[PDB]
């Protein structure tokens, strides 16, 4: 499914991402916009042989197992194929573990390139939460 901006903001707030480990809600909505364009089915194969899956493009080399990526660690202990649901539960759970590493949200390249340093609060303004 493709979330509407405000729809994802409300869901993400419901899923506890508003001020999770120092990051305001806007960061997460913005990340989803540029990482998957709000699409829970988004999947992109990478140069290093890994693949990113879901609303938050979780990588198969470190976080989920897709069985075709060399040197995988599967930190979120879950098959990448399970992060493609219209239910964002699984992706949020894993994202929280991801952001809990020292790299913070910098792990999300699109967030780093398109959100960090911008007025992220703009992504939740004008929304009924």
């Amino acid at each position: 499914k493709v979330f509407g901006r405000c729809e994802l903001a409300a869901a993400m707030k419901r899923h506890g991402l508003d001020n999770y480990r120092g990051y305001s809600l806007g960061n997460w909505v913005c990340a989803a916009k540029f990482e998957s364009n709000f699409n829970t089915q988004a999947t992109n194969r990478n140069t290093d042989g890994s693949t990113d899956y879901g609303i938050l493009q979780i990588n198969s080399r470190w976080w989920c197992n897709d069985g075709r990526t060399p040197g995988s660690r599967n930190l979120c202990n879950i098959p990448c194929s399970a992060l493609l649901s219209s239910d964002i539960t699984a992706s949020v759970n894993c994202a929280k573990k991801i952001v809990s590493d020292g790299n913070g949200m910098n792990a999300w390249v699109a967030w780093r390139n398109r959100c960090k340093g911008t007025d992220v609060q703009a992504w939740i303004r004008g929304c009924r939460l």
Partner: antibody
Amino acid sequence: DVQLQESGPSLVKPSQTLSLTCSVTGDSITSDYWSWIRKFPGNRLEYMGYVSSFGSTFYNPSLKSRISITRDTSKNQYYLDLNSVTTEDTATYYCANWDGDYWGQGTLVTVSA
Amino acid sequence: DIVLTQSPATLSVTPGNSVSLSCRASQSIGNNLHWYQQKSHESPRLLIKYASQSISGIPSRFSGSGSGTDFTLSINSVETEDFGMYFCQQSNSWPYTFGGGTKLEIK
């Protein structure tokens, strides 16, 4: 399946460094985030800190930077170092993964002259 | 740090009856509240993660609800194997903190 187990001295002197080891069986330590939690008398639990798979450490400010958490992949173990201990550090120490699914048996360490 | 307050400190109940334990946070933590059970001579055991998400291997009589600052652990038809301590723990902000615990014992 995964199993954790703490080991180390059960009695230490004030002012010394208290060190504990958590041995992990069932999978590589590089595949998870690892933590240390301790229980004081009176059912008081304190989260000491954790280390991510990439080596990033997070320590509870309550420890006043006297803590160090490290890992040894070849030995599949991770450790806890707590410097300049006092009787206030007597507690039951447990290691567990970040998710809270796997826990050690816990080991009592008493700080006494 | 975030302060977690659990009430009541102790709760006596007769097997078969239902109960609910409270855990309130000094500030909003979204759904980032987890529940642990701890018996004597044993390590804590995760019962519920993220306020209401179930954990495989845990009796289904355990459930959790709440958001923001108020959370609840509910036990449908308490069994004797349930007597012991219950702790809530937040992971919303560093340092992670634990509530003072609620003791469940037979009445």
